[PDB]
Amino acid sequence: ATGSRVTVVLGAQWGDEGKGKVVDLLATDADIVSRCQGGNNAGHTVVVDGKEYDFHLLPSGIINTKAVSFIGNGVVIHLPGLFEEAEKNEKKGLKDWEKRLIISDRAHLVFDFHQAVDGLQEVQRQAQEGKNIGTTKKGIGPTYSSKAARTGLRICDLLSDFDEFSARFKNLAHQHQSMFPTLEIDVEGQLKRLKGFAERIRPMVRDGVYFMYEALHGPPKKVLVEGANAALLDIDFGTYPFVTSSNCTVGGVCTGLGIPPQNIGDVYGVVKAYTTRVGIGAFPTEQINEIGDLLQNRGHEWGVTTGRKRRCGWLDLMILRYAHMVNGFTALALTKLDILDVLSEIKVGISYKLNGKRIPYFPANQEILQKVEVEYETLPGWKADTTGARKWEDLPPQAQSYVRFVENHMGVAVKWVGVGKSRESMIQLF
Amino acid sequence: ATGSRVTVVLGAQWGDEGKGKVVDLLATDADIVSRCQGGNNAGHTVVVDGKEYDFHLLPSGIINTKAVSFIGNGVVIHLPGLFEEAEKNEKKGLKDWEKRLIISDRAHLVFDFHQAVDGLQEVQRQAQEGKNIGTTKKGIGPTYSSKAARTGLRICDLLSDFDEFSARFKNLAHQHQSMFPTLEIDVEGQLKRLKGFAERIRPMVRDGVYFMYEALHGPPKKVLVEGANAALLDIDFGTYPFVTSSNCTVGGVCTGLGIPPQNIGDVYGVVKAYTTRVGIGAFPTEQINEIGDLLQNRGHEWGVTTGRKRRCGWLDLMILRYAHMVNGFTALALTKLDILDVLSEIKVGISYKLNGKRIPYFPANQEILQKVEVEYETLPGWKADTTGARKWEDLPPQAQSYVRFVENHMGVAVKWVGVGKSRESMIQLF
Ligand SMILES: Nc1ncnc2c1ncn2[C@@H]1O[C@H](COP(=O)(O)O)[C@@H](O)[C@H]1O
Numbered sequence A, B: 001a002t003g004s005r006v007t008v009v010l011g012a013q014w015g016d017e018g019k020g021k022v023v024d025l026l027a028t029d030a031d032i033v034s035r036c037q038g039g040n041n042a043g044h045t046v047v048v049d050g051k052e053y054d055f056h057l058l059p060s061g062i063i064n065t066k067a068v069s070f071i072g073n074g075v076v077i078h079l080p081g082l083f084e085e086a087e088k089n090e091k092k093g094l095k096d097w098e099k100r101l102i103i104s105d106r107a108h109l110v111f112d113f114h115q116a117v118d119g120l121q122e123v124q125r126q127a128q129e130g131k132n133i134g135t136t137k138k139g140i141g142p143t144y145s146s147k148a149a150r151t152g153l154r155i156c157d158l159l160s161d162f163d164e165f166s167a168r169f170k171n172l173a174h175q176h177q178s179m180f181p182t183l184e185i186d187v188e189g190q191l192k193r194l195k196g197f198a199e200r201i202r203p204m205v206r207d208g209v210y211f212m213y214e215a216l217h218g219p220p221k222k223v224l225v226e227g228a229n230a231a232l233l234d235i236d237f238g239t240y241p242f243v244t245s246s247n248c249t250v251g252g253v254c255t256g257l258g259i260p261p262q263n264i265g266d267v268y269g270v271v272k273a274y275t276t277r278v279g280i281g282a283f284p285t286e287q288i289n290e291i292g293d294l295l296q297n298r299g300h301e302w303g304v305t306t307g308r309k310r311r312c313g314w315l316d317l318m319i320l321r322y323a324h325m326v327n328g329f330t331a332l333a334l335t336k337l338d339i340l341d342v343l344s345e346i347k348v349g350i351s352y353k354l355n356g357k358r359i360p361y362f363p364a365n366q367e368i369l370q371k372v373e374v375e376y377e378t379l380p381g382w383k384a385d386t387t388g389a390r391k392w393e394d395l396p397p398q399a400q401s402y403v404r405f406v407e408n409h410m411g412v413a414v415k416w417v418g419v420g421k422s423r424e425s426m427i428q429l430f
């Protein structure tokens, strides 16, 4: 026919929905697990047999040895970070990864000064308007700006004539230094490492378009696309400008891997039982209080790197329904249900009210979102432990009702109930 | 089910494939005709009853009064140009357009200084490396760079508090002036016009995501997406950096309109009987000679604005097959076949040879593409006039064989044979 269809896992809120958990579960067999958009700031945690992992650039499937890990063209790479990451997991018992990895010759490079400028930009907007993005300061934003301007460099440029490279690498550095003359650049220093990376990389690089084409039109295969960040952090559809700079939405799978929509199959939306956000920006259901401290506590909602806790809030169906409109989820994975085990009552946002009147849709302007009153619906808690559930019957009543509530209001079937952090901690409803 | 599926028209070469011709034909009835990526530099020519049109930002369907013209979020708008355009067609007998148009509150704004910087950037790369992009100098590149950086402004920001707007508009101006301090900006001058535009715009603007969702999940409708630019000009898959700054490929339809892949139906690839390119960059089959002058002449291959002729070359199946891999065309529209009426023999590129050996795939690095030897296949010309054909039988033998050749080597059915410039000048094969 048209070939094999890919299976997509996407974040439906503001990140940290537990995507790594769903990816790792779906990859166990999968022939190919890939990354299509974003940079080394995914923070996809994978727990498998008392062995916790923190992948940021490498596909969450880099574990599975039978499968091949792929990084599409829509991804931005800061080589240093790449190896720094592989080596940290290389110590947790990860070997031979470099043999089952393939990089797309069309992906862009995040240069040291790129991560530099991110910081400047962030601190600049900081001491001027007393408000910044909340960036992870990993140059993703500036790398993408370079990409759009067509001044940034790609994997295929690094492997070609290192002499034509260096020249461009020089000019781009000087350009950025014009945005912030305070920015210093160890030109020949970074160029030095870069070329070392070149030879370290060369064996893994290939043509991505051709690659993915073969896999989808050759003999039947199972391809897994791991979305990064989330729906409301989408450069186009998120709470702009408090968003990342890539299309975390379904479209990015096409633009990032070079495959047509008809080769996209199941698109799973990972939904966390409650809402979190890291960084500046509106958060209608934010709960800066006892409850928010509780969610944040029981759900370990903190920077897996800097220890910075994330803002916590009740589940918000407004952003969820908005996300579905854009991604067209075929099913959902509801995670961290257990986090709600202890609450007597659980609130969930059903709509927004601006001046006593119910708004019709998710507002484009983030500033408006900061003034809405949230209309909640209070639900009965199951006040019990679910960490041991492994089938729909084990979950108590109110628990099941909570799953149905999400299912019903989104109009999308929940295919998975995350009730723990380990692989085994899922419950496949169907 | 999942709703109505959209019909997409995309360029398969380097632009000017005659997309406006296929759009206008497909829109005649269509309920909605939209634009998803790019800015006011589409140059989609529409000929209907001795009345020629040159649309650049307005959908080629803005003509059809029964239908609604839509501009998605992935599009970048330079308001001045918008009205300048509508008024030029307003003089060709276009009225009430402003009532059947709808702008997405999430689309980005191309500011006067943006088009400014484009020029500087172009001339800069000019007198330094003696080689630039070949840009249309309409600020598309800098607007997208701003978008990625999250410093650019959107339609929804212009309509909101003009006081919070102006402030941001000021800082962005000052930032660009740091890239080129030679750049001057009539700050309060442009801000002046802008606000005038605001009120002129307000009635046409809406929420795009909601809008398109309604149309695809409400009662059945026929939606037409008009791709701009082309496959090999794609920021991700084109001959980077000699490309435009948007995803002209199928993915951009999802990212630009906010609709999921399953809502994408027929994706038609417009293919011109020969190849053209405007701007710097590799062009394997370029024919700087008698033939190239002939194609360029008979096919009127020149800037519909500046009179700049486009580079002309034989049809090249390498880029075509590469394009199909990314867009997944369901059918093709082969245009300007008549242009070949007079040739005795017609050559077409089947593959690339680097150092006597046949390359396996379309090279990511544009520099490599500049060194390939083209392997051609010479075909018999029909040496006859086809401008009058209106059915598959009318076309002479070699003509039909030429259509089959394209069909066969791309593995995609040709559903349309453009043999003239007027609406009636098509031949629907099936
Ligand atoms: N994995 C992630 N989970 C949650 N928020 C994220 C994640 N990656 C980026 N963000 C947010 O995206 C915004 C832009 O950050 P950056 O990706 O560094 O451009 C900030 O508000 C970040 O907190």
Ligand SMILES: Nc1ncnc2c1ncn2[C@@H]1O[C@H](COP(=O)(O)O)[C@@H](O)[C@H]1O
Residues within 6 Å of the ligand: B014, B015, B016, B041, B042, B043, B133, B134, B135, B136, B137, B138, B140, B141, B228, B229, B233, B242, B243, B244, B245, B277, B278, B279, B280
């Ligand atoms: N409609 C078009 N047809 C052909 N080439 C185009 C078109 N629009 C842009 N380009 C090319 O795209 C490249 C970048 O130009 P710009 O779109 O101004 O960033 C140049 O090589 C242009 O000639």
